[PDB]
Amino acid sequence: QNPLPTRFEVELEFIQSLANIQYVTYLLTQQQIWKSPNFKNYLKYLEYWCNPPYSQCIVYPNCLFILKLLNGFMESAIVNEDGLLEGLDELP
Amino acid sequence: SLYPPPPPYVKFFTQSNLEKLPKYKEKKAAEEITCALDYLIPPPMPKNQQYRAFGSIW
């Protein structure tokens, strides 16, 4: 066994999980995490991975593209009162 | 839910802390985590280039 992951390791693992469309969906259609700007702000902070030397550690390149989309969307995305992301209400 | 939650560090990303960041970054210029603001600053690149990606998986 290995010791608990580093912050750098935790963030690299996490940004890369966004390469999975279903998972990103499960987040987008959460409730709590969109009440407060924290998560939104976190995802923009994560764009640190998009440039060297960081990007050179990315094995799952799609996650960077999806982060970018996800991010630009969030700027103009309208947040319902509960947390529901407005522009998505019609979809499951 | 085998889908993990976002990293614990998310709690630090308040709009308050974001406002304090520019001045903090300056002062700094004058693992070593000491306060909340440190989390709003990307972690340093490890020395072992074994974090360099072997290839792509799309």
CSV table of all heavy atoms in Angstrom, one decimal, chain B residues 3 11 13 29 31 34-35 44-45 48:
chain,number,residue,atom,x,y,z
B,3,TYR,N,-19.2,7.2,-7.4
B,3,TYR,CA,-18.7,8.5,-7.9
B,3,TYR,C,-18.3,9.3,-6.7
B,3,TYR,O,-19.1,9.7,-5.9
B,3,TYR,CB,-19.8,9.3,-8.6
B,3,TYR,CG,-20.0,8.8,-10.1
B,3,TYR,CD1,-21.3,8.7,-10.6
B,3,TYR,CD2,-19.0,8.6,-10.9
B,3,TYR,CE1,-21.5,8.3,-11.9
B,3,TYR,CE2,-19.1,8.2,-12.2
B,3,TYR,CZ,-20.4,8.1,-12.7
B,3,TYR,OH,-20.6,7.7,-14.0
B,11,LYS,N,-13.9,23.7,-0.2
B,11,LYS,CA,-14.4,24.6,0.8
B,11,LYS,C,-13.7,25.9,0.9
B,11,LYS,O,-14.2,26.9,1.3
B,11,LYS,CB,-14.5,24.0,2.1
B,11,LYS,CG,-13.2,23.7,2.9
B,11,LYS,CD,-13.4,22.8,4.0
B,11,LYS,CE,-12.6,23.2,5.3
B,11,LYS,NZ,-13.1,22.5,6.5
B,13,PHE,N,-12.6,27.8,-1.5
B,13,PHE,CA,-12.7,28.6,-2.7
B,13,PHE,C,-13.9,29.5,-2.6
B,13,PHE,O,-14.8,29.5,-3.4
B,13,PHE,CB,-12.7,27.7,-3.9
B,13,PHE,CG,-11.4,27.3,-4.4
B,13,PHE,CD1,-10.7,26.3,-3.6
B,13,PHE,CD2,-10.8,27.8,-5.5
B,13,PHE,CE1,-9.5,25.8,-4.0
B,13,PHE,CE2,-9.5,27.4,-5.8
B,13,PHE,CZ,-8.8,26.4,-5.1
B,29,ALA,N,5.7,36.3,-2.3
B,29,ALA,CA,7.0,36.6,-3.1
B,29,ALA,C,8.1,37.2,-2.3
B,29,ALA,O,9.3,37.1,-2.6
B,29,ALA,CB,6.7,37.5,-4.3
B,31,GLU,N,5.5,19.9,0.6
B,31,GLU,CA,4.3,20.5,1.1
B,31,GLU,C,4.5,21.5,2.2
B,31,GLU,O,5.0,21.2,3.3
B,31,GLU,CB,3.3,19.4,1.6
B,31,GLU,CG,2.2,20.0,2.4
B,31,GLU,CD,1.1,18.9,2.8
B,31,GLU,OE1,1.0,17.9,2.0
B,31,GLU,OE2,0.5,19.0,3.9
B,34,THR,N,0.0,26.4,5.3
B,34,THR,CA,0.0,27.1,6.5
B,34,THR,C,-1.3,27.8,6.8
B,34,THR,O,-1.8,28.0,7.9
B,34,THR,CB,1.1,28.2,6.7
B,34,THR,OG1,0.9,29.2,5.7
B,34,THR,CG2,2.5,27.6,6.4
B,35,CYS,N,-2.0,28.1,5.7
B,35,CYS,CA,-3.3,28.8,5.8
B,35,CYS,C,-4.2,28.5,4.7
B,35,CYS,O,-3.8,27.8,3.7
B,35,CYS,CB,-3.1,30.3,5.9
B,35,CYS,SG,-2.4,31.0,4.3
B,44,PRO,N,3.0,22.5,-6.3
B,44,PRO,CA,4.3,22.5,-7.1
B,44,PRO,C,4.4,21.2,-7.8
B,44,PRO,O,4.0,20.1,-7.4
B,44,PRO,CB,5.4,22.6,-6.0
B,44,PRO,CG,4.6,22.8,-4.7
B,44,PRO,CD,3.3,22.2,-4.9
B,45,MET,N,5.1,21.3,-9.0
B,45,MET,CA,5.5,20.1,-9.7
B,45,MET,C,6.5,19.2,-9.0
B,45,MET,O,7.5,19.7,-8.5
B,45,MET,CB,6.1,20.4,-11.1
B,45,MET,CG,5.1,20.9,-12.1
B,45,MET,SD,4.3,19.5,-13.2
B,45,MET,CE,5.7,18.1,-13.0
B,48,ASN,N,10.3,13.9,-9.4
B,48,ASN,CA,10.3,12.7,-10.2
B,48,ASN,C,9.4,12.8,-11.5
B,48,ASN,O,8.2,12.9,-11.4
B,48,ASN,CB,9.8,11.5,-9.4
B,48,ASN,CG,8.6,11.8,-8.5
B,48,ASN,OD1,8.7,12.8,-7.8
B,48,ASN,ND2,7.6,11.0,-8.4
